[PDB]
Design a protein around this ligand. Structure first.
Ligand SMILES: [Ca+2]
Length: 483
């Protein structure tokens, strides 16, 4: 019971708290620092001593937008951030299902070790193993320089994720898990990453089930990636023959360059500058397209969105984008033809701006992904409607279902100043129960909810809220409009 586990790279020593074995800060790759910056993740150097796995590793460098809110104590940052954490219920039973979390944060923020993602409650209550992890963010993970050198790899953050999943397949049995029953789950950028992992050749067979919360197919073209890379190099004063400084410049300077780039190219929510990109060697094509071809055949999918996603990105006092920028967004998201047809739906205003986020950045991609996958595997869809009744947090906004999934309800205080009522504890119980039953069986049905299979003929959807309900082909009008 002293919890020493041998990984393929060396022994790690965990701890046991309240019936949950925990190992924090386990290296799964070589620190992508200096000369290893912008390169695919490599195995970490082996160690023959006994690594103390009781403290979280550093988080990837990022502006403090999210850290200063998610932590009461700002965590240490460093490009040396590739670590995984394992939470396992103290049970005699071995080969427990494994749930691997990929955190969100629009590809430039977050960490697997945010308090919100502590997997103790989820592990104990669902009797599954929970794995959390960090992957390169912003310019460290979603700055694609392949066009400047075949030695560099694009979609680094996604390759990091794939490497962590490979680590799980190769090592989790040692922690009491079943490497053949791995469920990957994530929200926001994590859901979008899972969309990509489902379509990435180098991720084949790394997981058997998937949960995509508020996030589906999301990529920029190969052309845009090259365009943004050149623009980025300029801000750094680096050119085709000075690619040396890329491996010597301080990480802190890469973050500044990124923010300047953000400002220079006037980045807006509809087209993030750092996100996955098409690339023959890593992400051959749009996830949605690959899935429609059956690339994820046989893999059960639990997918959904929150009813009021957009209200998380804009406050009542937020500036309203110009027509010029709005048209450019609609056109980029739906294409010239559909953009014009739907222009009607979004007449300039804060309202339309927000509805554009919910509808085009989350709902439409979700329905498109669920619909496509329904021809090759079981699909289960939901819409999260819960929210405090009284203002100003009376909207089912992006991120709000997270405390319920993980059961860390204290987070609801900072997220929506909501108290933990029996109503809240009950919704969390139903959600955790469905998520863990799905990880165990590939079907999220539980005594609390009999989840109907989602297919294009009826599009039955489960509505998560104080009272569970089922809607058939929700928002039919809009769907028919957007499709
Ligand atoms: Ca022991």
């Amino acid at each position: 019971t002293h919890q020493i586990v041998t990984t393929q790279y060396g022994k790690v020593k965990g701890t046991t708290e309240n019936g949950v074995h925990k190992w924090k800060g386990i290296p799964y790759a070589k620190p992508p620092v200096g000369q290893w910056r912008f390169k695919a993740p490599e195995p970490p150097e082996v160690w023959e001593d006994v690594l103390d796995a009781t403290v979280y590793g550093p988080v990837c460098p990022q502006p403090s937008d999210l850290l200063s809110l998610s932590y009461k104590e700002l965590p240490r940052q460093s490009e040396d951030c590739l670590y995984v954490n394992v939470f396992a219920p103290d049970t005699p039973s071995q080969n427990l299902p494994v749930m691997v979390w990929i955190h969100g944060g629009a590809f430039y923020l977050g960490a697997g070790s945010e308090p919100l993602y502590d997997g103790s409650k989820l592990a104990a209550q669902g009797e599954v193993i929970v794995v959390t992890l960090n992957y390169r963010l912003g310019p460290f993970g979603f700055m694609h320089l392949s066009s400047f050198d075949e030695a560099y790899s694009d979609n680094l953050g996604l390759l990091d994720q794939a490497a962590a999943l490979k680590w799980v397949r190769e090592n989790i049995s040692a922690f009491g898990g079943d490497p053949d029953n791995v469920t990957v789950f994530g929200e926001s950028a994590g859901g979008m990453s899972i969309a990509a992992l489902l379509a990435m050749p180098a991720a084949k067979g790394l997981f058997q089930k998937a949960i995509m919360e508020s996030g589906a197919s999301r990529t920029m073209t190969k052309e845009q990636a090259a365009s943004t890379a050149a623009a980025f190099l300029q801000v750094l004063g680096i050119n085709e023959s000075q690619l040396d400084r890329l491996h010597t410049v301080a990480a802190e300077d890469l973050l500044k360059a990124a923010d300047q780039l953000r400002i220079a190219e006037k980045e807006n929510i509809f087209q993030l500058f750092f996100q996955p990109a098409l690339d023959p060697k890593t992400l051959p094509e749009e996830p949605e397209k690959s899935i429609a071809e059956g690339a994820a055949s046989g893999i059960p999918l639990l997918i959904g969105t929150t009813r009021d996603e957009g209200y998380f990105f804009f406050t009542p006092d937020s500036d309203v984008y110009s027509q010029e920028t709005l048209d450019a967004a609609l056109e980029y998201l739906l294409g010239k033809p559909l953009a014009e047809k739907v222009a009607d739906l979004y007449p300039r205003s804060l309202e339309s701006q927000i509805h554009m986020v919910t509808d085009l950045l989350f709902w439409r991609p979700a329905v498109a992904f669920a619909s496509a996958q329904s021809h090759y595997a079981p699909v289960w869809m939901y819409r999260f409607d819960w929210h405090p009744e009284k203002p100003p947090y009376n909207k089912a906004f992006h991120t709000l279902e997270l405390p319920f999934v993980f059961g860390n309800l204290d987070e609801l205080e900072r997220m929506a100043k909501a108290e933990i009522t029996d109503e809240v504890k009950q919704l969390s119980h139903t959600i955790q129960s469905a998520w863990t039953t799905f990880a165990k069986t590939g079907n999220p049905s539980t005594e609390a909810v009999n989840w109907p299979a989602y297919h294009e003929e009826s599009r039955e959807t489960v509505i998560l809220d104080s009272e569970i309900t089922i809607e058939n082909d929700p928002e039919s009008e809009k769907r028919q409009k957007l499709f």
